[PDB]
Amino acid sequence: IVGGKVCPKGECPWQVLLLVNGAQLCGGTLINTIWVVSAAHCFDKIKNWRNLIAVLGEHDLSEHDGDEQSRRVAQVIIPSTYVPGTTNHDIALLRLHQPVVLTDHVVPLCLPERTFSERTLAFVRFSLVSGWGQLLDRGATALELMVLNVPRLMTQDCLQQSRPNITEYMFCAGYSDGSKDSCKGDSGGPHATHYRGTWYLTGIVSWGQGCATVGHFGVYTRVSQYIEWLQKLMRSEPRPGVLLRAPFP
Amino acid sequence: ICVNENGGCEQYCSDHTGTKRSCRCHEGYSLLADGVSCTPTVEYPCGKIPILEKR
Ligand SMILES: COc1cc(Br)ccc1O
Numbered sequence: 001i002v003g004g005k006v007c008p009k010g011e012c013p014w015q016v017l018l019l020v021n022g023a024q025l026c027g028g029t030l031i032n033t034i035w036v037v038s039a040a041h042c043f044d045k046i047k048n049w050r051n052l053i054a055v056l057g058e059h060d061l062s063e064h065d066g067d068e069q070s071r072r073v074a075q076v077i078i079p080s081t082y083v084p085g086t087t088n089h090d091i092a093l094l095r096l097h098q099p100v101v102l103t104d105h106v107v108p109l110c111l112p113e114r115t116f117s118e119r120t121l122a123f124v125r126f127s128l129v130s131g132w133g134q135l136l137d138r139g140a141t142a143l144e145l146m147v148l149n150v151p152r153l154m155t156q157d158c159l160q161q162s163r164p165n166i167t168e169y170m171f172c173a174g175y176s177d178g179s180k181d182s183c184k185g186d187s188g189g190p191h192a193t194h195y196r197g198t199w200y201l202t203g204i205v206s207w208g209q210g211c212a213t214v215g216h217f218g219v220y221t222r223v224s225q226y227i228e229w230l231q232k233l234m235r236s237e238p239r240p241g242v243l244l245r246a247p248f249p
Numbered sequence: 250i251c252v253n254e255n256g257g258c259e260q261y262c263s264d265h266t267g268t269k270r271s272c273r274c275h276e277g278y279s280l281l282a283d284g285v286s287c288t289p290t291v292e293y294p295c296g297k298i299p300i301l302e303k304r
């Protein structure tokens with residue numbers, strides 16, 4: 001996250017940290033006790049599918065304070081339309097091997113209904129993006145979880161205000177003055193929208209031209225397009241093998 | 250009714266045959282008798298921050 005602030009401990013309780021062989025991979029969002037939503041592009045280079053860990057209640061990477069909960073990722077579900085190395089349909093649904101325990105530090109973000117998300121949430125101007133990604137373009141990653149408030153743009157405005165294509169499965173958010181943005185290591189993390197006292201999942205940190213590049217905005221997976229796809233999978237029985245490609249729509 | 254200001258619903262809105270509207274809530278919430286407000290039914294409902302809620 002570029003130009004944000006430290007998320008006070010426990011104020012982003014749905015934030016997930018994804019690890020591969022103990023190394024920082026991506027972010028994710030907890031949506032109930034066993035499911036996490038992340039970005040499909042996070043898994044393009046994975047070979048050790050069995051060494052993928054999700055950490056909940058994480059805040060400071062240099063210290064174990066007891067609120068952290070680690071779980072093995074039992075399944076990574078990606079839409080059939082996602083093509084590795086590309087940006088469209090950038091979403092993954094992760095099943096944890098064992099549920100996390102909900103505490104003051106581990107709480108899911110509401111996955112909203114499609115209609116509510118399209119006709120109401122899509123018009124809330126500002127939303128929060130968070131992660132332990134780079135603090136600067138070509139800079140070091142954060143030790144404490146960072147958060148940033150970003151305004152959402154209509155795609156027509158994003159295309160006009162900018163210096164890959166922006167599809168109906170994406171949306172732009174951020175600033176064009178090179179000061180504030182999500183970064184590479186924030187990938188898969190939440191774009192969370194507040195509405196009438198409750199927070200909802202509206203976007204996933206997906207891609208951009210560098211980090212906080214002048215004349216460019218952050219690009220987020222438009223989660224509303226995947227609500228029914230996500231809901232159907234969550235009502236399904238697990239299958240052998242970690243990676244699962246599922247028909248989209 | 251639902252397209253305009255979420256039909257007055259705090260959370261989800263369903264349009265019905267006629268001028269009828271039903272508000273609904275995410276799991277871990279129940280709809281109040283006002284027919285619009287959602288109240289938590291669990292200790293850790295989704296999208297709420299306990300350290301801020303208890304403050
Ligand atoms: C994953 O990489 C990025 C994502 C967003 Br959103 C903005 C800039 C980036 O470099």
Ligand SMILES: [Ca+2]
Pocket residue numbers: 058059060061062063064065068
């Ligand atoms: Ca820690």
